[PDB]
Nucleic acid binder design. Sequence first.
RNA 1: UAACUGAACGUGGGCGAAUGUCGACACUAGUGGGCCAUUUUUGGUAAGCAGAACUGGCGAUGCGGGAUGAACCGAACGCGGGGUUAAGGUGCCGGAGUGGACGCUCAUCAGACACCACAAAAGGCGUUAGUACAUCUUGACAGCAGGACGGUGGCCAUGGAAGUCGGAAUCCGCUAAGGACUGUGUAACAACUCACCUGCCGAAUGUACUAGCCCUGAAAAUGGAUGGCGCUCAAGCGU
RNA 2: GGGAUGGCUUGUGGCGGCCAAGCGUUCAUAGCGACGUCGCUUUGAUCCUUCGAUGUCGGCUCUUCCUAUCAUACCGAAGCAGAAUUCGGUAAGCGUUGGAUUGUACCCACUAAUAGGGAACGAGCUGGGUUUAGACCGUCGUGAGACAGGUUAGUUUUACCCUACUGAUGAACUCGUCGCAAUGGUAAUUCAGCUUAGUACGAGAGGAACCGCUGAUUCAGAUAAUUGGUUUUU
Lengths: 190, 65, 174, 109, 245
Amino acid sequence: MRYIHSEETIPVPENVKVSIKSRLVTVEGPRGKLQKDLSHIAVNFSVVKKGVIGLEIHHGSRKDVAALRTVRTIINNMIIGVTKGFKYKMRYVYAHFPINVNVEKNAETGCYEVEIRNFIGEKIVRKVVMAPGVEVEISKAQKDELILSGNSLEAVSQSAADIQQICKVRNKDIRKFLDGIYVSEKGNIV
Amino acid sequence: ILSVKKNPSNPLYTQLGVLTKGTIIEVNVSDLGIVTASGKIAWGRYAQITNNPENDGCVNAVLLV
Amino acid sequence: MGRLQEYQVIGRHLPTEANPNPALYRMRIFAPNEVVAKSRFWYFLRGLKKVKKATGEIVSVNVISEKHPLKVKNFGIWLRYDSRSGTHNMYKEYRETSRVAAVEAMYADMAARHRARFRSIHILKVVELEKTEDVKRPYIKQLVAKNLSFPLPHRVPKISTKKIFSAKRPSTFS
Amino acid sequence: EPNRKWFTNTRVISQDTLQSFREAMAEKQKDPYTVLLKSNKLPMSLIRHQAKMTIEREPFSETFGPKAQRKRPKLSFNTVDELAGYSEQSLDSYHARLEEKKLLSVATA
Amino acid sequence: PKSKRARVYHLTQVNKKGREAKERLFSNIRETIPKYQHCFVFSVDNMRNNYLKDVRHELNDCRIFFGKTKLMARALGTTPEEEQADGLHRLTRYLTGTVGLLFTNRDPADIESYFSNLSQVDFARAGTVAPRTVTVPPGIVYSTGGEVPPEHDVPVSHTLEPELRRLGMPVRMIKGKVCLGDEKGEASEGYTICKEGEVLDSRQTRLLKLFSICLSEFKVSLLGYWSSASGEVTELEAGKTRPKR
RNA sequence: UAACUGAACGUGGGCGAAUGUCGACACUAGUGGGCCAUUUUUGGUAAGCAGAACUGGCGAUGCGGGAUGAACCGAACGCGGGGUUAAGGUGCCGGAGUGGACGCUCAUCAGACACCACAAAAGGCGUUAGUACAUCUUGACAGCAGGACGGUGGCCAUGGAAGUCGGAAUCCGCUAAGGACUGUGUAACAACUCACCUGCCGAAUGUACUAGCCCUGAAAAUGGAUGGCGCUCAAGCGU
RNA sequence: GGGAUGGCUUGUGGCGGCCAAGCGUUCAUAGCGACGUCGCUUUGAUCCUUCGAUGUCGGCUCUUCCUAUCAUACCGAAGCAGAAUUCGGUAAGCGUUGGAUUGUACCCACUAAUAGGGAACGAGCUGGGUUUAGACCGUCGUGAGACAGGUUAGUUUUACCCUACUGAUGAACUCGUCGCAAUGGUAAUUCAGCUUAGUACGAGAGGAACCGCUGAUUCAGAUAAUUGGUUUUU
């Protein structure tokens, strides 16, 4: 079955500017500006109402209709990123060797870098380079905690996943060795 | 097994005592307690081989009760 | 199954001394021509009654033309078809302009979707859905919707196959 | 071919005859210098579970495991005095066996 | 449509009720009408509603129905052409949201007095406003989370630590003790579950329920009552404020 | 025959369904228990297979198409010219359509010559079309916020066992509803959760089958084959 | 004179009886049947039960391929504390040894490991099956002789042809110098020691790993200062 018309709607707050040109969405708000190329999905954008974006597919199959939900959630996440931001709080715990985490800003690349030392007594220094736009802060309120803040949910969550996956225990019982860095809390900055 | 009574393919096969499918053999049934009407022990009874021993590695038979 | 036409085929058993006036049997048959129409009549009549071609006669064959071929109609077709499992019912609907067009579309659709040929499809009933709420399948429930207006995105322009080379890249917006 | 004699007893023998035959043949095996004559025509076919019970009474699953219901061990002693004597004689036997094994670089092939 | 959610079959004794439960509710409500003089409508909104068993036990001579709102409305009769008794369609206008029926032969003044002084302290649900600020102090986490003095409190169970971490408290397991920060109460600040004048969500209410902190109350509010003798509905105080449909 | 009463054979006379259109000698051969195929019949095997009967073909035979070929399809042959076809084809090699209509399928070596085996009542949270049964504004499926109780820590057993180590039963009340309990958990409790019910919401869903196409459903060893390039609203599949 | 089964095969037994989703079946209520289950095929024993070559395999050298992975690389699970593992997955890049025993295929050691196959078994050399002619013993035969057999000694001896391979020249475009890179080949391998650290982990016994450093095994490409070897430097 091919459905003749299928539509989704996105409400837009007052402080958001959305510019779509050849399926390239540019969302700018108080915190910053994000861009995303959605040209790989056949979709027609329109202004159905004031502050309302309309997404429509004509003569599409069920897969083509279902793709609009992904596009809707992507644009909504961009709007939430430029309005409230995204914040991932991570906690690093240890049993015997205290894990040392250093955060600096590589200014030549314009991006933050995290150096992890003494992970279960290893002499190697693990290094994680952040995606641009993600800011790393060692939390002063709680103990042994990083905070990743940004406008791009994909960038912040991918940086968090990189920090988890660079600290993995190998050739040991994971029931006994609980060392590592884990994402404790996910939420919005504001 | 007490004797080979009939190999249906050839009387020479019965003379040689070949155990194949459909062969009538004579077995000692002393461990089954088959008794005559006055108390005599029936210790010999015919049975038929119901498998292919040359392909199975064992002889399986059914009593002719 | 070709350019089909609908035929009223009336036949009967041959009159004998026992039965001077045998009963007449009438069927509506979708067939490409009158020979196929009479053959299908004798096949279906052998399937129901003690009449065959050697013991019966074809009284009448008349083409049943559509009353309003310029009126767009919705048709419900109830049919049985033969598969490797057995006989199965299907009810389908087709939005066409005539019964013969609906039956041709049904034959093409059943061939495409279930690999059923003309030899293994029996047409039991073809009806016109006179009201909109009689429409049950969603693909025509979406066509009978109020104020149905849609565009035609990505229309490849009709370019002649004998003109091999073009000087500009074609547009797909007209 | 079907026949009535397929479903009849082919060799029968009575209680007293079988017992007398077995007793006489056993007396014949007692002497190694006495051998039978025409032994191929003689009925020589007539002449020639604690673990299971324990497993039946106590299954392996009820003995040890996550579903085990065993609570009382099986002992070879009844009171403390026989326990002490059992330990003493067990230690003595263990030491004697160790001395026996001691009395009884890798080696070449 | 191959890609579909696997519908889990439940190997439990209790099954879905269905239409027969609705018919039983209809029969019970339509049979309790000709035996009781007054029929009250009460409301318990945004409340745990687990003391209704105690209310039923205390009012032994009364009959309480707490079924579906629309089911109770259709049982009493929405229109005057289908009402079981006269004036019941006037009573059905108050049945919106979480409400219940109370068939009684007592004094309406006695019923109002009982549902006035009846009050039990209860756990807050999501959407309520926090009356105060609750903060678990840093250090060893106890069962009440600082409600009682720490010298009179058992430490919280070690099995609740993953639940607290999932609910957002950055607690940790030190020597079999759930501790916030360190063992000696250093290097961390207290965890503020809720702030005064803040709408409680499910996470905060679940944290308060785990720490046995009650920040709400169980109040049954009487909206109105229909009398069989007068054949009329007298509307009480909460009935004016509560919306009708 | 009781009988010109019959039996044959003569005398004389009168008067037939459709379609197509040879016999006897003489002399002289070669081959007379070959192969393959459809149908029918008889026996079996784990599967293969082994027999007979008729017919057709080959050995004796070229031509067009199956890329190619003893057994297939079409058609049988003097030397040439013109026209039309059969079987098979029309993206290029290759003469002829990137022809038209309606759909289906995306394959980590699809498919385009399949029927046989692998192989099954086989496994797919691939995708379409149907059939049956069921729920639903008296609010269906999914979610979110809560309840999920009392006799009772039911009986026996166990060092301890309170729904959740075991055995046997498995009832009643309050019900809107809640199992002498679905899992997590405790030494045992506690606590959480499931079944079930209510509040918010808003209109169609759920289960099992059936028919298509697709994935897997077992593969070795020099580098290679729908004939090759290549083909994805096909240059694949059905009409 | 005539000759010299194959899109087969692989990982899970048979016979007999129950149970059963289902297939059938309503004028006969029979018959097949997946999944299972049940009977026959020493309390860690015994060592006092090796059960028939008609069919033939090996070895040297050397190359390549397959994966159905023994080791190395990575990953998932297991009371997997550590150490050592076990089970499984992707993966053929790289390796997979030296010996004993012929009164006739298993043992031993080193090692990371001593994985399994194909291209033969549907005119390279060399030991058995294996067997021309001489001879002996055993069995059979009156015999010549034959064999249930056992032992000894014993004649095939190319290449200069074409192709393939390995290398070396080369006409045409004046000769020569310096270059580019389509295509073809392709290379590294494993272990040990120091430090981490007697640390993590552990009741104890024991006991790692990442980064860093230094050697060695096997393979490969060169080289002759030095040391052995070679002597027609006659």
